[PDB]
From Swiss-Prot, chains A, B:
GO terms for cellular component: chloroplast; chloroplast stroma; plastid. Belongs to the ThiC family. Binds 1 [4Fe-4S] cluster per subunit. The cluster is coordinated with 3 cysteines and an exchangeable S-adenosyl-L-methionine. The keyword Chloroplast applies. Strongly expressed in cotyledons, leaves, flowers and siliques, and, to a lower extent, in roots. Expressed in all green tissues, but not in roots, seeds, and petals. This is Phosphomethylpyrimidine synthase, chloroplastic. The gene is THIC. Keywords: 4Fe-4S, Chloroplast, Iron, Iron-sulfur, Lyase, Metal-binding, Plastid, S-adenosyl-L-methionine, Thiamine biosynthesis, Transit peptide, Zinc. [4Fe-4S] cluster binds at C492, C495, C500. It comes from Arabidopsis thaliana.
């Protein structure tokens, strides 16, 4: 019974917003789905602006956990009977599931389009049947670009209470998925509390706990230990597993001349084991057995990039792309068993090398969703790697990357705290939305337009309410002009009343009203 | 006699760094030039790492001002006699000036290459002969990407003391130029203190003070008022003027259907005057007279973009590109009189629209240096516009933009303070360097490689010392591991000792020492 403390309220974080749900009926089952969104209430005769909402149910006691909203969906499918439980299996049968309709509604797209994307392997809906608390979401290039927030303890830092806070906090600010990457104490328990209290998909990297199960002795890992860890985590409801099955024995020497070696945590663990025994990666060898596990729960596979580059020097090297080729093989094998797959990508990559990454992944991995860690576009600014990587994430997102794993200001320096989690999520929501705009994703610009209209019209509170982080925008403005009257002033302190360009435009257009721009 | 207060010392900001100078001789004159750089002193047998340095002379009493290092250069050229005083004039005569050699040295490139770039109009060296305190620098696509920091008061906020602090502070963190954009009290005096204490080029937007000279009544502007303002500012040493001479009367109606209208401060002032009189822009009409002024001092012209887009909605519209076409005409006219020119660019531009901006500017403006305000890649995150725009700035920098005007976290909200200035400069140094890497600019990656080598080798203090902001990186690490011993630990709190991937790689390579990767 951890001493859980509440995050700041939705209302504190998003003034003028309300949580809403769109009700739709899943016709085959008759199940009524309540698909979340937020509504930003505006002034001056503007219609309210509806936006995406990952924050999940609010004010729920963490000792009790979230409502098991998917229970009737899972129970009905079990009673009907099925050989496999994955969204890809259902999609290939021509079945539109509750999860697919929920995602279609959430994305403002057709349910058949969702089904098609999942069936062809170009989108995934990470949704383990044991994660009944989940509000379904979809990851794929044809959908909104999504953001993952990484949390979890280490042996050096944090606690159960703080990690649960961090999941609620990450999702408040826009995280679409989270991963519990705990490598310290109480791994199982920490994850249980998180899953029961997470409305978003939860991923893990099972090799971390497997290594803990053998007391940090990598040589004592093997398939059997790993298999038991997979089943344990699947039973709790983990929606996706990062598995570094492309770190093949023969690829390891390709890293010998790298500047920063193997920087992947899981990748380095597999490499250590492979070298210790001179034997092929056991997750690769047992790929089919992993697929059998995934089929029973619907755990999606996030095929790791254990040989990703950890420095600009190492970007796009032979080791990295050898693994990418194998990720594609593993992807196609998974699809033969109807297991949902995404592929993990780099890393530290300078901007001119970003296009090659997307081109090769799209081709070699048959358009499976891509899931990048950034990339960081330069190594020079630890303390600011949310910015160095927002540049790369936005770029690779624009080229088609479906899920952007965040990077916080603590990257390369220490375990992120709750403040760093917020900073990382905001930077990544910026990158993801900038990518949506670059892709001309339907209706993405409506958000920018609503805020910009409020800006031009000096509807200051509306401007703040429409932004990613309303209280930051408001407090920043108020540092110089805190008075209530300034919230309707046609200027701010940047230019002052006589040099505000939008006020000058306002006067210009007023002058032009009577007959136009043609008279003195 | 303002109450000037010192910025934190170079040593506080950059532990393990020293300010150094490379001495070179200007052969025609015999003048000895002392070209600044910094040297980062490293451990473990690494050679010291030399980097660029804009911070200028340190610990100089602002009441006294900086040494007039260029005095002998200017005096000698005056004694020789010349019809025009610009670096472009000298370059076209085949003359390598002190300024050109200084820049060549600072860029590690050949002085003839610098001369060629300036002569052809593809680079500028903003260096008014009255700014004797200036350490010369070059702006151009063939050189390091540069950053401008905007400072200055408004009628609502700040003071002379604070603005001088901000210039010293901006340059400490890497600003390559600054602009004094004051629109409040004491404009002339504020600028005088800044120029006498600035080792970097100082730009202004003369129409702001011209409008102040006529008490904010735009209708009382005219060429004569503007001309007197130009001469006043030139006499003080302003190195470049933003002049919105492309805001033509006939382009103004093209803005009528824009979401955010005319967002340029200077552009809106010119538009108001043009509409008031139904007369062509007086700066356009008197372009030749402006060139005559610039020739006598070497003031470079930064041709404004008064019709830049101020929202994603307005990006790449007819008004914006009409002005760009005119900027090209004005550029070619300026070159006929040997006046140095750069062109100002957008703005708010979504990523997919960035390439068109560069393509049209390179063609229509004959490769003159481009100088962008960002661009911001989305409107959704006021409070974080240093990040929304770092993405655009890095992108457009990669495509060839030579000078990136910073955007601080206070953009759209209020006047930036000293903290915001630092945040903006750091974000922009990231964008500029990421662009240098993307362009494969010679030796740019050496910086990333040195930091990444320190990272892999757990030379923590070296890693911090090599970064853009050493004390931030150090303090962030120390939030979880503050002990001195942690500065040599082969892990940090992110992974802890047993999950650090670089330590695992370290052990892996140690194992492989005896004979290789082929044995169990
Ligand atoms: N407990 C945790 N909380 C938040 N992020 C974590 C985490 N454990 C691992 N991560 C993420 O996983 C990464 C692996 S450790 C270092 C990886 C390396 N910097 C690289 O370039 O890939 C971390 O840097 C962090 O981004
Ligand atoms: N005194 C000052 N200090 C710092 N930046 C200034 C400044 N005066 C003007 N600026 C810069 O010039 C801009 C003009 S005012 C608003 C411009 C608008 N946001 C746009 O998209 O172009 C400011 O936003 C700021 O970026
Ligand atoms: N998204 C991504 C791409 N490459 C790595 N990651 C993420 O990085 C984390 C740690 O992975 P690893 O064990 O490979 O270092 C996990 O969150 C994983 O999804
Ligand atoms: N670099 C740039 C490109 N477009 C505008 N700017 C900068 O924006 C500021 C204000 O310009 P304006 O008067 O056009 O709003 C000046 O610093 C100018 O160089
Ligand atoms: S004063 Fe300047 S920064 Fe403030 S609202 Fe007006 S145009 Fe924007
Ligand atoms: S513990 Fe993880 S984050 Fe820290 S130095 Fe090692 S690899 Fe990097
Ligand atoms: Cl690291
Ligand atoms: Cl604004
Ligand atoms: Fe890294
Ligand atoms: Fe703007």
């Amino acid at each position: 019974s951890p001493d859980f403390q509440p995050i700041p309220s939705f209302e504190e974080c998003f003034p003028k917003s309300t949580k809403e749900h769109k009700e739709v009926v899943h016709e085959e089952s008759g199940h009524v789905l309540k698909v979340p969104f937020r509504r930003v209430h505006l002034s001056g005769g503007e219609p309210a602006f509806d936006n995406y909402d990952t924050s999940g149910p609010q004010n729920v006691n963490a000792h009790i956990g979230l409502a098991k909203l998917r229970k009737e969906w899972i129970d009905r499918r079990e009673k009907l009977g099925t050989p496999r439980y994955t969204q890809m299996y259902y999609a290939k049968q021509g079945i539109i599931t509750e999860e697919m309709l929920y995602c279609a509604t959430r994305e403002k797209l057709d349910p058949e389009f969702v089904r098609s994307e999942v069936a062809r392997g170009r989108a995934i809906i990470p949704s383990n049947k044991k994660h009944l608390e989940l509000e379904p979401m979809i990851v794929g290039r044809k959908f909104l670009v999504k953001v993952n927030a990484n949390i979890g303890n280490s042996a050096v830092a944090s606690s159960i209470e703080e990690e649960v806070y961090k999941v609620q906090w990450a999702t408040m600010w826009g995280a679409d998925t989270i991963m519990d990457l705990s490598t310290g104490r109480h791994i199982h328990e920490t994850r249980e509390w998180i899953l029961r209290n997470s409305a978003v998909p939860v991923g893990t990297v099972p090799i971390y706990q497997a290594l803990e199960k053998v007391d940090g002795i990598a040589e004592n890992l093997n398939w059997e230990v790993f298999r038991e860890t997979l089943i344990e985590q699947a039973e709790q409801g983990v929606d996706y597993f990062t598995i570094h099955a492309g770190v093949l024995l023969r690829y390891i020497p390709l890293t010998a001349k790298r500047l920063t070696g193997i920087v992947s945590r899981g990748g380095s663990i597999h490499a250590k084991w492979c070298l210790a025994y001179h034997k092929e990666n056991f997750a690769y060898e047992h790929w089919d057995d992993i697929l059998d596990i995934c089929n029973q729960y619907d755990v999606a596979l996030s095929i790791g990039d254990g040989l990703r580059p950890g420095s600009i020097y190492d970007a796009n090297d032979t080791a990295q792309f050898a693994e990418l080729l194998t990720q594609g093989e593993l992807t196609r094998r998974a699809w033969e068993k109807d297991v949902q797959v995404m592929n993990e990508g780099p890393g530290h990559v300078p901007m001119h090398k970003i296009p090659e990454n997307m081109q090769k992944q799209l081709e070699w991995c048959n358009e499976a969703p891509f899931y990048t860690l950034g990339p960081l576009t330069t190594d020079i600014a630890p303390g600011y790697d949310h910015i160095t990587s927002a540049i790369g994430a936005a770029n690779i997102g624009a080229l088609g990357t479906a899920l952007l794993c965040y990077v916080t200001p603590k990257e390369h320096l220490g375990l992120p705290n709750r403040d760093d989690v917020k900073a990382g999520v905001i930077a990544y929501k910026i990158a993801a939305h900038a990518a949506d705009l670059a892709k001309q994703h339907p209706h993405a610009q409506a958000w920018d337009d609503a805020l910009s209209k409020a800006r031009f019209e000096f509807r200051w509170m509306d401007q703040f309410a429409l932004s990613l982080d309303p209280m930051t925008a408001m407090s920043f403005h108020d540092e110089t002009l805190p008075a209530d009257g300034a919230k309707v002033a046609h200027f701010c302190s940047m230019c002052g009343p006589k040099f505000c360009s939008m006020k000058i435009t306002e006067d210009i257009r007023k002058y032009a009203e009577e007959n136009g721009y043609g008279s003195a």
